[PDB]
Amino acid sequence: RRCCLGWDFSTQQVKVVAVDAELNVFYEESVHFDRDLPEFGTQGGVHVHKDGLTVTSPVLMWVQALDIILEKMKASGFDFSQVLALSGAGQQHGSIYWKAGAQQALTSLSPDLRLHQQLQDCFSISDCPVWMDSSTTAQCRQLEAAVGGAQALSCLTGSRAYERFTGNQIAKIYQQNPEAYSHTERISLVSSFAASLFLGSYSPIDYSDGSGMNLLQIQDKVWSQACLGACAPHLEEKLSPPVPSCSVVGAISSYYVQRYGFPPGCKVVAFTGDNPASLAGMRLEEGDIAVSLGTSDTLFLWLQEPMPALEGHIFCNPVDSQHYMALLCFKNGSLMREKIRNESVSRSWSDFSKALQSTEMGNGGNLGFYFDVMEITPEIIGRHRFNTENHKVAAFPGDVEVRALIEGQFMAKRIHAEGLGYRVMSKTKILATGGASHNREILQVLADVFDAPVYVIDTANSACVGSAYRAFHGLAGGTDVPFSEVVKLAPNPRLAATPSPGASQVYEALLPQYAKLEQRILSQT
């Protein structure tokens, strides 16, 4: 059974899957940080500092989690001689600061010792900033001022300045800890840090995860000298040139061959961010979108011609380096759906579904926005309801409320997607995942709004699986063959809904009206 490994260096755990050549996930293992490395004192895999804004993880905890999981794999009888290649994902934005001399330690790893034991003194920063950090507002404003504004920075890098984005974190470390910065020979993302551990030498940063830093020029795929200089000095030398995501970055270190029995020819395919890896795992193509429904809703888009904005994040595409992808994040997700259920349909998902079945597409022209917490896409708060004459109203009947919520949430996803350059195409498939993807009536609204078929997919391990698929791509020809052709053989996700007759006519007229009301609410703020 020949296989590839797909890794995920996530916030709360390190996870791995082994996928055979039939693209069967036949093995999965994980190390949970709070539970299995409780000595670091993390909660949810991180440390929220006294200020309530700084959020970090110890780099040596991630190294040790790799040692533990390889030993857990070996203890279970995993046959490492069967591994042809591996790739992985890292929680985006988080950064690792390697101390001067660390590459000599990586290239001289002894198979008689664990990684953590040998890399103990290799980090100039022990507490790494992660994606949950919101402590760099001053640096964000400085970077936007240095490059001509928020929109200029988005045009250049796919995003305006966000506190968690790596360049702003690097700037804070340079300003507050210049000694540690002066002792840093290399800076990695979590993804490229993990790839470096497998190579036994520094891995380059890939174009896709490299797009989550406010540093890479996404169009020309070179570092922006203006962004680099506005963040910290000598920064280019520390990052090294970025590479296409579908690059073989080297063979696995002899460390792993000797300690665990990996074959010497095992290839390391460049690692990427967890959201880019999930896009690969979900097998999105040109014209596709994925809706991940949860506490936060996340929209994944394929983009040929992106239009960066003051919202959303455009990244270089991990499975087609000449094109792009985007993420749009919505704070009012599953808690907002549960609240309307509890308020209007007796705390019952069945009655929620019956409300959707008993109301027509377009909801008689009744439209609603439901933001009990400040929304990020767009920046609005409150509940706002409008009747068919576009007059504000205080409330709706119960069933009308349920449809206004669901239809409005999906119309917002289509409008904001199209603002970034997305367009529905004849080939378009919509992939739905998360709790609400288990409701047929919710997915019917989604199919109706986009006028395209909706498929349900399980994504508990999408970043791991996507990483294993990318590794197989690397083996099946790399850039000589399309990613989509390599993983076509994986069973197709199940069709949940197709647009009802007349859906096109209803939402062609209602979508611009909903967009107009959104701008009306934004103008009143």
DSSP codes, 44-76: TTBEE-TTSS-EEEEHHHHHHHHHHHHHHHHHT
CATH code: domain of residue 334: 3.30.420.40
Residue 240 burial (10 A CB sphere; 0-12, 13-18, 19+): middle
496: tokens are: 């949940």
Q: Are residues 149 and 111 part of one domain?
A: yes
Give the resolution to one decimal, in Å. Answer: 1.7
Q: 207 and 289 share a domain? A: no
Phi, psi values for residue 392, rounded to 5°: -60, 140
Q: Is 366 annotated as a binding residue?
A: no
Segments forming the whole domain that contains residue 291? 283-457+493-525
My answer on whether 29 and 68 are in the same domain is: yes
Give the integer Cα–Cα distance in Å for 189 and 193.
6
268 and 358 together in one domain: no
DSSP assignment of 215-279 equals -EETTTTEE-HHHHHHH-TTHHHHH---B-SS-EEEEPPHHHHHHH---TT-EEE--EEHHHHHH
What experimental approach yielded this model? Answer: X-ray
Given a contact cutoff of 8 angstroms between Cβ atoms, the answer to whether 316 and 221 are in contact is yes
Residues 148, 163 share a domain: yes
Contact 33, 93 (CB under 8 A): no
- The verdict on 12 and 115 lying in the same domain is yes
Same domain, 230 and 299: no
Distances 360 to 32, 411, 417, 447, 454 between C-alpha atoms, Å = 46, 15, 24, 14, 19
- With b meaning 16 or more CB within 10 Å and e meaning fewer, what string describes 100-113? eebbebbeebeeee
Round to whole Å and give the CA distance between 19 and 52: 40
Say if residue 436 carries a ligand binding annotation: yes
- Tally of residues, the chain: 525
For residue 317, say whether it is annotated as part of any ligand binding site: no
What's the CA gap between 446 and 437, in Å, rounded?
10
Token pair in block for residue 193: 């840090």
Cα distance between residue 369 and residue 413, in whole Å:
12
For the chain, the domain total comes to 2
Say if residue 45 is in the same domain as residue 177: yes
Buried b (16+ CB within 10 A) or exposed e, 327-362: bbbbbbbeebbeebbeebbeeebeebbebbeebebb
- Shared domain for 274 and 291, answered yes or no, is no
Q: Give CA–CA dist 286/276, Å, rounded.
A: 15
270 and 295 belong to one structural domain = no
Backbone angles phi, psi at 375, to 5 degrees: -85, 155
Hey, how many other C-beta atoms are within 10 angstroms of the C-beta on 237? 10
Quote the CA–CA distance of 460 and 456 in Å, as a whole number.
13
At residue 155, φ and ψ (nearest 5 deg) are -55, -45
- In a shared domain, residues 273 and 381: no
User: Looking up tokens 């928020």, which residue turns up?
Assistant: 150
Tell me the β-bridge partners of 89: 8, 272
My answer on whether omega of the bond before 378 falls inside 30° of 0, hence cis, is yes
Task: Mark out the alpha helices in 282-422 (DSSP H runs).
Answer: 334-344, 349-357, 398-419
Q: Which two tokens stand for residue 40?
A: 């670091």
Q: Say if residue 439 carries a ligand binding annotation.
A: yes
Whether residue 254 is found in the same domain as residue 305: no
